[PDB]
Amino acid sequence: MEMEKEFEQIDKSGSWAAIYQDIRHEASDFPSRVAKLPKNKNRNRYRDVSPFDHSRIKLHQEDNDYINASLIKMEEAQRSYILTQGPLPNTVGHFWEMVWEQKSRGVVMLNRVMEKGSLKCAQYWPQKEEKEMIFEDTNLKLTLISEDIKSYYTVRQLELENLTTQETREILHFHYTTWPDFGVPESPASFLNFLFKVRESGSLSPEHGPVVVHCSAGIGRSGTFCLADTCLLLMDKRKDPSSVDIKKVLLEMRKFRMGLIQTADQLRFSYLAVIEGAKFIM
Ligand SMILES: O=C(c1ccco1)N1CCN(C(=O)C2CC2)CC1
């Protein structure tokens, strides 16, 4: 079926939970043996969210190459994304090592450091120009260059230096700051505006390594971001945009990381975002 009318048909019939459970039942199951090794327990935020072995990002290290991060490679859309958990106190150096080694231009953050009164990820970037951060375990230096605070999101320019080679690179930090503590946003308008700002920066384009996108677990809000982006790109590429099937695209993405889209409300929000976004594109 088309999307907008399939949408109203699920609303009128109140069957979002049943649609979402079908997706959960059909989703791929692949091994995640490296994630579960005892030496990696303090590298995982949640025991039930792990990268598959076949798609995990490897750190360029011989001691321990593990990080909780996955490469989502969308062949028809010609887009790639790295989805990862919010960094932990003992993985902030690994996080920036990955950004460096994978040649990423942008980092997309969809959570606040504190939500619901609890810490959802480490404070992993510097908040003042004159107070830079050094990660001694991976030999990197990170400096805040500029910050632009808007009503729904903040964009930061960061300088990452590899202290071993003295090479430097400019990284863009795109921080969506207004996702509610509970539920999903009422309108997709600010989320779509944010997606378009990431696109306009070049961070999603083939001349760079894959964008790094995270929330707390790296599957819920993060899944919504890449699902919406890929579906809108396919609607621009195909002769028949009504042929784009958001459930099929989501199941393709779940071949590369488990659990993408965590609730039926996130599924409905993803539909809403693609529907409204397709009208603005034209
Ligand atoms: O593609 C874009 C776009 C291009 C340039 C700037 O934005 N958008 C904007 C937001 N959209 C909405 O429907 C908002 C609810 C108004 C549609 C998608």
UniProtKB/Swiss-Prot annotation:
Keywords per UniProt: Acetylation, Endoplasmic reticulum, Hydrolase, Membrane, Oxidation, Phosphoprotein, Protein phosphatase, S-nitrosylation
Catalysed transformations (reactions): O-phospho-L-tyrosyl-[protein] + H2O = L-tyrosyl-[protein] + phosphate
Residues bearing the modification Phosphotyrosine: Y20, Y66
Example GO molecular function: insulin receptor binding
Domain Tyrosine-protein phosphatase: 3-277
Tissues where this protein is expressed: Expressed in keratinocytes (at protein level).
Effect of S50 to A/D: No phosphorylation
Residue positions where Cysteine persulfide is found in the record: C215
Bilayer topology annotation: Peripheral membrane protein
Active site: C215 (phosphocysteine intermediate)
GO cellular component, one term: early endosome
Keyword Membrane annotated: yes
Modification sites for Cysteine sulfenic acid (-SOH): C215
Compartment annotation: Endoplasmic reticulum membrane
Residues found modified as Phosphoserine: S50, S242, S243
Modified residues (N-acetylmethionine): M1
The protein's enzyme class: hydrolase
Modified residues (Cysteine sulfinic acid (-SO2H)): C215
Post-translational modifications: Oxidized on Cys-215; the Cys-SOH formed in response to redox signaling reacts with the alpha-amido of the following residue to form a sulfenamide cross-link, triggering a conformational change that inhibits substrate binding and activity. The active site can be restored by reduction. Ser-50 is the major site of phosphorylation as compared to Ser-242 and Ser-243. Activated by phosphorylation at Ser-50.
UniProt: substrate binding residues: D181, C215, S216, A217, G218, I219, G220, R221, Q262
BP term (GO), one: negative regulation of neuron projection development
Its EC number(s): 3.1.3.48
Family stated for the protein in its record: Belongs to the protein-tyrosine phosphatase family. Non-receptor class 1 subfamily.
Quaternary context: Interacts with EPHA3 (phosphorylated); dephosphorylates EPHA3 and may regulate its trafficking and function. Interacts with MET. Interacts with NCK1.
Main function: Tyrosine-protein phosphatase which acts as a regulator of endoplasmic reticulum unfolded protein response. Mediates dephosphorylation of EIF2AK3/PERK; inactivating the protein kinase activity of EIF2AK3/PERK. May play an important role in CKII- and p60c-src-induced signal transduction cascades. May regulate the EFNA5-EPHA3 signaling pathway which modulates cell reorganization and cell-cell repulsion. May also regulate the hepatocyte growth factor receptor signaling pathway through dephosphorylation of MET.
Protein name: Tyrosine-protein phosphatase non-receptor type 1
Organism: Homo sapiens (Human)
